[PDB]
Amino acid sequence: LSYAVNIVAALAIIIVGLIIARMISNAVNRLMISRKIDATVADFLSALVRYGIIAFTLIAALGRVGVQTASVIAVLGAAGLAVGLALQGSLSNLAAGVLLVMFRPFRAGEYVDLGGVAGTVLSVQIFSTTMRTADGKIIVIPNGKIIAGNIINFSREPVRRNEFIIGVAYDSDIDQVKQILTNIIQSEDRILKDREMTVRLNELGASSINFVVRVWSNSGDLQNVYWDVLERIKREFDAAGISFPYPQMDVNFKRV
Amino acid sequence: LSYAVNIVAALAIIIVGLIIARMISNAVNRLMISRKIDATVADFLSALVRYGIIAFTLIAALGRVGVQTASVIAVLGAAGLAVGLALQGSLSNLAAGVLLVMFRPFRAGEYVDLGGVAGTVLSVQIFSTTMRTADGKIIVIPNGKIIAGNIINFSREPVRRNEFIIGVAYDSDIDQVKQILTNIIQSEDRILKDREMTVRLNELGASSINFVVRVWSNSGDLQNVYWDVLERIKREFDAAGISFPYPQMDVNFKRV
Amino acid sequence: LSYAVNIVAALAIIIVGLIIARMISNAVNRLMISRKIDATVADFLSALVRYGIIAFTLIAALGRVGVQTASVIAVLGAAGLAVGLALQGSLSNLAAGVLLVMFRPFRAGEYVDLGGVAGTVLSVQIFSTTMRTADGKIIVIPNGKIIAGNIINFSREPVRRNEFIIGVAYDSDIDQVKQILTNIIQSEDRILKDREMTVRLNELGASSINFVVRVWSNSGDLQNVYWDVLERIKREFDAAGISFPYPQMDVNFKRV
Amino acid sequence: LSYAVNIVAALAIIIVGLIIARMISNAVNRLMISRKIDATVADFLSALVRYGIIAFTLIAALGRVGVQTASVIAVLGAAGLAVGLALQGSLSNLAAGVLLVMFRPFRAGEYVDLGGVAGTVLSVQIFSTTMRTADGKIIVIPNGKIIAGNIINFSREPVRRNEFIIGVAYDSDIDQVKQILTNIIQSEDRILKDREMTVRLNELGASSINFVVRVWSNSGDLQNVYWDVLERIKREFDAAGISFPYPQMDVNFKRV
Amino acid sequence: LSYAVNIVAALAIIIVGLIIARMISNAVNRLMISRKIDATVADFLSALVRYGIIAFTLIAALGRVGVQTASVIAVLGAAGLAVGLALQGSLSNLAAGVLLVMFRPFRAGEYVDLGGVAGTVLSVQIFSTTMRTADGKIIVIPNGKIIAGNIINFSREPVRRNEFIIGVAYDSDIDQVKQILTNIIQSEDRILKDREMTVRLNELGASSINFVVRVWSNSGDLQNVYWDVLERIKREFDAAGISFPYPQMDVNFKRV
Amino acid sequence: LSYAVNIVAALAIIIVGLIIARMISNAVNRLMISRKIDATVADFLSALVRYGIIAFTLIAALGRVGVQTASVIAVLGAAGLAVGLALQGSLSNLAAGVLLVMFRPFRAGEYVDLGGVAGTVLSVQIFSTTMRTADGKIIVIPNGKIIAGNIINFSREPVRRNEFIIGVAYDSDIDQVKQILTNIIQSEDRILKDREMTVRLNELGASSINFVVRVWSNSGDLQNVYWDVLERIKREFDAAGISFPYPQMDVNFKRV
Amino acid sequence: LSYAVNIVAALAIIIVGLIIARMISNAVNRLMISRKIDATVADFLSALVRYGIIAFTLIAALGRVGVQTASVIAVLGAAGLAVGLALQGSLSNLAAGVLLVMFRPFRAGEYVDLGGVAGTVLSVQIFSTTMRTADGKIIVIPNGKIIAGNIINFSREPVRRNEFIIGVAYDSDIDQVKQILTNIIQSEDRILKDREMTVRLNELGASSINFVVRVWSNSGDLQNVYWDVLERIKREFDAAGISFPYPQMDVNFKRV
């Protein structure tokens, strides 16, 4: 009767608002992904302008039922903070996923350590990056946790350093051990000779002397250099009388 | 007398506001779940438009009792931030449950590890996903904790890697152990031969040499490959003189 | 004199505001708890509409003393954020207690583990659920901590899995132990035979081999199956020569 | 001259504002503590209406010096958020102290454990509850920490459960130990016989079998039942040949 | 020329604003510290009214240069939230220092434990209380950390409880130990005889029986009662054949 | 044409706004650092009034291009909260650095412990204090972490207390040890004799009696008193038959 | 028809708004990076003025379609808080990266320890600094974590202190050890003689006396001084009869 004759006009204005929403959203999506910025930020601005002009046609619509503008924008601001505080941690991930592609602390296919978990990065999606670990698991890390912590890129510099700690007995000859561990890493072929090769006495432990051996090698064959120097240490120390010691004790008897 | 004759009109306007609230809410619920988006986001927008036009008819109603618009929207904004800060963590879960179905880091029936707790995902509800652990417990995790942490999907890639660490004595022959642990995993049928099969000296421990054996196999029979290679290691090491060592000590007597 | 003649009208308007506050609050309380929703949310909306129309009659009252509307709503918005930030954690519990009855991750009388503390849920009150632990203590957990953490419902699925870890000596026969621990759990009557019954070599520990035995049984008699299989393991291993080992050592003498 | 002749009127309006502030504050304090609610919430609303009508007379006063209303409410809103964010954690404690008396998870004189610290509650003040521990210390816990954590009310249910864990040697007779620990707790008079009395094999430890004995008794004499069953266990096990074992070892000699 | 002739009037209005700021600030400081409240809250309200009427004369001043009120209060609200979010943790300490003097969980010169750190309180300043520890260090704790944690007032109740745990050997006579530890604390003069004096078997440890002895004494001479009962325990146990045991072991030889 | 003829006036108004910004900022900087407050707070108010009247001339400028005031202050309030939430933790440090110079819990050149890290304070800058540790490292701590944690000023009181814990054997004479450790600290010259000198039996440990010796000395020579009393303890205990004990054991043989 | 004839004018106004946005943004970028401040803050103000006058031309544009200003600024304020709470942790890093170059707690190429991770700083980018560790890894730390924690600049002061802890046996001569460890560090050439050289008895440990030796040397050759004094300690102690002790025990036999 007296009410519905404006409700039909409100439905017409809201359906042409939906039409112009799809039109302007797809227009700015077609323009921005080709002109300047990105395929990800432009979709965010497309959704922003889409749900912005939806809000504009809602404010224009709800005046036709008598509801004033200062009340419509109050209810829309309440609903806007409702959906905005729903999407706080859902949009911090998007804003971080922009920075992870714009600045690239890691590329796809690069062994990283994103705060405890270490693996090859498969892809950086919109909200969360997928990495595959060393043992075949798939770890999906949200972008708000990557950008708010350290990113230990294991595979961006070509040379990396091993660190063997060889515990020998206290009665061994330090010159003989420092000569044997030198003659191992002087004949190893993948250990870089133009960098810092150290075989020096690291510490005097509880039951063993700890020598430290730190050698540099290319990041592809780091683990093979570790496994081939350690096995050769185990071979050349038994053939030379050096004894890896057990956890020694010094028991004093009191046969009461 | 002078007051109630507008209160009856306010009750009529609020009851037709309830009627039009149910009408528009069920209309957008009928339209949106069929046209574009989702069964979950559309119910959220249904509740939003429902408690939005309830607020609109309240603002239209409370002017009939003399209360102005700028005071009604102030009290309604206070009540709106009250109910909104009541529903902060009650709506972050809904916004995360949208992303867990839209992007799917896990499907139903897939062994995951959602930050410490590991189990098969049964279903993803509106606010909280139910998983069943390995031992029959039912763990209900809210969606705000899933999307704000790692999601270790144990069952999305078909191949996974075991890691045995076999400690042998120091006097054993490293060639014999590296031949026996090779001849075990060369004859095992479910271990993938086209991938990285390593039997190399991992470390020189305190009382034992630790060999590492890392083999790849399909994610269904990973645990059976573990339990059948470990039992065969225990069988083939006793039949070959290799000795798993006890926690050795090196007691020096001082019979005072 | 010139001031109090409006103060009496302000007191009359505020006392009829209290009267209409009780009237409308009890009216919506009488309507909503019977029609649609809940006994808990409807009391919240009753308090909201009560302290909303108290605020409306305060705004209508304080114009009679000359104070304008834009100042009254400013002081009322300050007081509203004061009482609202007083009731942040006092209302997050109410909004979570709505979800704990609407979605029911636990019912009353069901053994749960609400993040570290495990017990039978007695009741879910408005702000905090009471559970009784295994040892008679009464733990009152606020609802903001239940819904923001895992809910390990120990008693919603009927079948659950035990896990015995039996450490035997290294010189024992693995076939004999895998036959004895099979013949125990094949003759136990409450262990479910149509599910996964595993007696396989879990690990080679420091001084003992760890067999794992994982059997499924109904959640009522899980603990009795544990206590009756473990006692029978202790009985059948002494009668068969299998020896549970002490923490072995391998002392090497050096009588200096 | 031209300025001070309004400043005297501003001082008169502010001094009558102080007078009416004391009047209305003491009036609502006299009315509310007797009529409906509480001695604590009514003082909060007294302070709220007091510093509200102080603000109203300030807004009415500062227009007499030419300063407009939209600037006075801006500076007052800035000062209001200043004092409100000063009193965030100073008012969360008051809002929690309302709930600790309205719902009573503990009464005065009741042994509780408010998140790590355990003691008898002396009183619940406005901002912080005082408890006296077992050893005479006085711990003042703020109410924001009580209501945001577990409340383990040790003394609201009358029956509670002890748990002895008795470690015996491996060569002992399990029937003899299960008969002796039954005959102790069958003759103890304060152990409730109509509840669950368990003497069953809990675990096979490293150097000892752990029996668990869990008996129910009244919460007043729980500790005396513990101290009188444990002493009788120590008496009846020496008189029966059962041996509490030392930390056993299994040293294997190698006299090199 | 055309601009500066209003700038001189703006400087005159701002210098008389500074004059009236000092006047009203010192007036309310002179009135409030003598009449009702406090020396600390009144200085806070003095600073608040001072930087409030500075803001009022700034709003009155900047209209003389053409800048409107709705822009001046916008820039002043931005600067106000800037200085307010600068002073969040700088004013929470002041609001807590009001409560630490108004309610007094500790007075000056009283041994407390304000969450980990324990010492004699020297003074409670405006923002941070100074305590002197047992070992002469000076610890300055901010008031936001005191009021948001436990306050273990070691020196507000006069009687406190010691707890000795005496480990004896397993072969000792429990009646003899319970008689000797009774005859020590029956003859000690500062141990309160009208309170709970317990010498009962606390636990059966790994290599020792632990007796617990808990006696009450005045809080001044608690440590001297500890040091004089423990020394007398060490004296009376050697004179009676009771043996404090070393960490016993139960080595089983296997001379392979 | 029709647009740029106001843009030139906008550029003239903004360049005279920059000129008056530098003028008023340097004027208040010249006035405030000499008259009342500080060299640090006055620069903050200089930056505040500078970027405030920059905002005022921007609001006056952007009306010349047709943009209204209520939109300019909306965009400026958005940008203001943007730069303000950029500078939250960048200004909490400034507000804390005001309090660290105004109240001085440490002066420059005073050994402190600002929550885990201990060193001599070099200087208190605007945002972060520099300390030099004992071992020459330079630790830059932001002021938001100093004022929100304990400040253990090691060097504000002149006397401090050592605490030696001397473990002797169980068969030693307690009178002889309490006489020797008294005769050491009675003849030491830097130990303060008018304070509390304690040599009393602290505890009966596992394999040793622990005497506690706590003596007071001036804070300059505390470490030298420690190093000279401990060396004299080691000298006077070997010359008196007291034996520092090794970690005793009580092995019971079972030659099976 | 009736609608699009204003939409073409809106597109013309928005395209000239984009043109003037690029113009004014590049103008202030060209002016500010050369005149006063920085290459980083000026780009931030360029983006701020760019997306500010984009917002101004949007507010001017959307009035041509009938939408009022108070609704356009409401939707733009909602979108502004949306993008601002997206960029909270994305702009705290920029505001911290301003302070890390303005105040410089580290320069490029300087060994630091930014809260757990220690390495040479390569560069300070806009949002995150890259450091290279000792072992060739590349760690990208966001600037919000550097400025909100300690910055242990290992390489800003030239002299640093080693700390050897030498454990010797209990029967050794303290004068001989304090003479040998003095004669080592008196003849070492890189140890600074004008600073504090300490060889004093640090502690009486469980099975060893711990001497502390703390010497100062230049920060370049600190590690070489450590490795050359420790090796000489190991050489000169075997040549002098001092014995580094094993973990001593004091076994008491009870051959039961």
mmCIF file of N, CA and C in Angstrom, chain B residues 109-152:
data_model
loop_
_atom_site.group_PDB
_atom_site.id
_atom_site.type_symbol
_atom_site.label_atom_id
_atom_site.label_comp_id
_atom_site.label_asym_id
_atom_site.label_seq_id
_atom_site.Cartn_x
_atom_site.Cartn_y
_atom_site.Cartn_z
ATOM 1 N N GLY B 109 39.176 -35.928 6.588
ATOM 2 C CA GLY B 109 39.812 -37.222 6.476
ATOM 3 C C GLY B 109 41.229 -37.111 5.962
ATOM 4 N N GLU B 110 42.071 -36.383 6.686
ATOM 5 C CA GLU B 110 43.450 -36.161 6.266
ATOM 6 C C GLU B 110 44.262 -35.878 7.513
ATOM 7 N N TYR B 111 45.289 -36.681 7.759
ATOM 8 C CA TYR B 111 46.059 -36.607 8.997
ATOM 9 C C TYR B 111 46.861 -35.317 9.029
ATOM 10 N N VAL B 112 46.543 -34.422 9.964
ATOM 11 C CA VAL B 112 47.237 -33.144 10.062
ATOM 12 C C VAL B 112 47.829 -32.974 11.447
ATOM 13 N N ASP B 113 48.533 -31.865 11.658
ATOM 14 C CA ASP B 113 49.144 -31.523 12.944
ATOM 15 C C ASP B 113 48.942 -30.016 13.083
ATOM 16 N N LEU B 114 47.865 -29.620 13.755
ATOM 17 C CA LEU B 114 47.498 -28.208 13.865
ATOM 18 C C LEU B 114 48.133 -27.572 15.100
ATOM 19 N N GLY B 115 49.460 -27.591 15.123
ATOM 20 C CA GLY B 115 50.194 -26.939 16.186
ATOM 21 C C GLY B 115 50.274 -27.741 17.464
ATOM 22 N N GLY B 116 50.873 -28.924 17.389
ATOM 23 C CA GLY B 116 51.091 -29.733 18.569
ATOM 24 C C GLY B 116 50.212 -30.961 18.632
ATOM 25 N N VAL B 117 48.947 -30.812 18.253
ATOM 26 C CA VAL B 117 47.981 -31.902 18.278
ATOM 27 C C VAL B 117 47.812 -32.439 16.867
ATOM 28 N N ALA B 118 47.907 -33.756 16.721
ATOM 29 C CA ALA B 118 47.938 -34.396 15.416
ATOM 30 C C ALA B 118 46.811 -35.407 15.316
ATOM 31 N N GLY B 119 46.041 -35.330 14.240
ATOM 32 C CA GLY B 119 44.955 -36.278 14.073
ATOM 33 C C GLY B 119 44.277 -36.131 12.733
ATOM 34 N N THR B 120 43.363 -37.057 12.476
ATOM 35 C CA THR B 120 42.560 -37.040 11.265
ATOM 36 C C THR B 120 41.442 -36.019 11.391
ATOM 37 N N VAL B 121 41.343 -35.102 10.433
ATOM 38 C CA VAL B 121 40.281 -34.103 10.470
ATOM 39 C C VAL B 121 38.957 -34.764 10.118
ATOM 40 N N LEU B 122 37.985 -34.675 11.025
ATOM 41 C CA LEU B 122 36.649 -35.186 10.771
ATOM 42 C C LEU B 122 35.821 -34.207 9.957
ATOM 43 N N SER B 123 35.702 -32.972 10.434
ATOM 44 C CA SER B 123 34.885 -31.978 9.760
ATOM 45 C C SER B 123 35.343 -30.593 10.174
ATOM 46 N N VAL B 124 35.030 -29.621 9.332
ATOM 47 C CA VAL B 124 35.285 -28.214 9.607
ATOM 48 C C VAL B 124 33.926 -27.557 9.805
ATOM 49 N N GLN B 125 33.563 -27.292 11.054
ATOM 50 C CA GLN B 125 32.297 -26.634 11.341
ATOM 51 C C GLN B 125 32.444 -25.130 11.152
ATOM 52 N N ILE B 126 31.452 -24.383 11.635
ATOM 53 C CA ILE B 126 31.431 -22.940 11.438
ATOM 54 C C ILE B 126 32.505 -22.271 12.280
ATOM 55 N N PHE B 127 32.619 -22.658 13.548
ATOM 56 C CA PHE B 127 33.558 -22.012 14.450
ATOM 57 C C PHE B 127 34.758 -22.861 14.831
ATOM 58 N N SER B 128 34.696 -24.181 14.677
ATOM 59 C CA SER B 128 35.739 -25.030 15.236
ATOM 60 C C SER B 128 35.777 -26.360 14.510
ATOM 61 N N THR B 129 36.974 -26.811 14.154
ATOM 62 C CA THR B 129 37.129 -28.087 13.476
ATOM 63 C C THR B 129 37.359 -29.204 14.474
ATOM 64 N N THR B 130 36.737 -30.338 14.203
ATOM 65 C CA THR B 130 36.865 -31.534 15.013
ATOM 66 C C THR B 130 37.874 -32.457 14.358
ATOM 67 N N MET B 131 38.862 -32.901 15.118
ATOM 68 C CA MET B 131 39.772 -33.927 14.650
ATOM 69 C C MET B 131 39.732 -35.094 15.621
ATOM 70 N N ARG B 132 39.960 -36.286 15.103
ATOM 71 C CA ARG B 132 40.092 -37.477 15.918
ATOM 72 C C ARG B 132 41.550 -37.876 15.912
ATOM 73 N N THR B 133 42.140 -38.029 17.089
ATOM 74 C CA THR B 133 43.564 -38.320 17.152
ATOM 75 C C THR B 133 43.866 -39.763 16.782
ATOM 76 N N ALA B 134 45.109 -40.184 16.986
ATOM 77 C CA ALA B 134 45.449 -41.570 16.708
ATOM 78 C C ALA B 134 44.815 -42.498 17.728
ATOM 79 N N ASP B 135 44.663 -42.033 18.965
ATOM 80 C CA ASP B 135 44.160 -42.849 20.064
ATOM 81 C C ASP B 135 42.724 -42.516 20.423
ATOM 82 N N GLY B 136 41.886 -42.222 19.440
ATOM 83 C CA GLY B 136 40.458 -42.164 19.649
ATOM 84 C C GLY B 136 39.924 -40.954 20.378
ATOM 85 N N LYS B 137 40.772 -40.045 20.841
ATOM 86 C CA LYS B 137 40.259 -38.837 21.459
ATOM 87 C C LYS B 137 39.714 -37.905 20.391
ATOM 88 N N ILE B 138 38.812 -37.026 20.801
ATOM 89 C CA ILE B 138 38.202 -36.053 19.909
ATOM 90 C C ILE B 138 38.658 -34.680 20.365
ATOM 91 N N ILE B 139 39.384 -33.979 19.505
ATOM 92 C CA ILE B 139 39.944 -32.676 19.820
ATOM 93 C C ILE B 139 39.238 -31.640 18.969
ATOM 94 N N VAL B 140 38.617 -30.668 19.618
ATOM 95 C CA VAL B 140 37.897 -29.600 18.944
ATOM 96 C C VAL B 140 38.776 -28.363 19.003
ATOM 97 N N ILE B 141 39.315 -27.959 17.865
ATOM 98 C CA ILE B 141 40.226 -26.821 17.781
ATOM 99 C C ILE B 141 39.464 -25.649 17.181
ATOM 100 N N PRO B 142 39.479 -24.476 17.803
ATOM 101 C CA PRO B 142 38.836 -23.316 17.190
ATOM 102 C C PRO B 142 39.625 -22.838 15.988
ATOM 103 N N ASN B 143 38.914 -22.253 15.025
ATOM 104 C CA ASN B 143 39.541 -21.885 13.763
ATOM 105 C C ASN B 143 40.500 -20.715 13.888
ATOM 106 N N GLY B 144 40.412 -19.925 14.955
ATOM 107 C CA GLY B 144 41.375 -18.863 15.149
ATOM 108 C C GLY B 144 42.755 -19.344 15.519
ATOM 109 N N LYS B 145 42.868 -20.573 16.011
ATOM 110 C CA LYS B 145 44.158 -21.153 16.344
ATOM 111 C C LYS B 145 44.757 -21.949 15.203
ATOM 112 N N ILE B 146 43.931 -22.436 14.284
ATOM 113 C CA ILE B 146 44.446 -23.160 13.130
ATOM 114 C C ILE B 146 45.099 -22.199 12.152
ATOM 115 N N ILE B 147 44.388 -21.131 11.793
ATOM 116 C CA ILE B 147 44.865 -20.204 10.777
ATOM 117 C C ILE B 147 45.978 -19.300 11.281
ATOM 118 N N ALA B 148 46.218 -19.259 12.589
ATOM 119 C CA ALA B 148 47.285 -18.452 13.163
ATOM 120 C C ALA B 148 48.447 -19.314 13.633
ATOM 121 N N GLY B 149 48.685 -20.423 12.946
ATOM 122 C CA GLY B 149 49.776 -21.314 13.275
ATOM 123 C C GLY B 149 50.026 -22.222 12.095
ATOM 124 N N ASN B 150 51.033 -23.074 12.236
ATOM 125 C CA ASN B 150 51.386 -23.966 11.147
ATOM 126 C C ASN B 150 50.351 -25.070 11.005
ATOM 127 N N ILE B 151 50.223 -25.568 9.783
ATOM 128 C CA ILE B 151 49.334 -26.677 9.480
ATOM 129 C C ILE B 151 50.180 -27.732 8.790
ATOM 130 N N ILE B 152 50.621 -28.734 9.541
ATOM 131 C CA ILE B 152 51.545 -29.733 9.017
ATOM 132 C C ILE B 152 50.690 -30.857 8.448
#
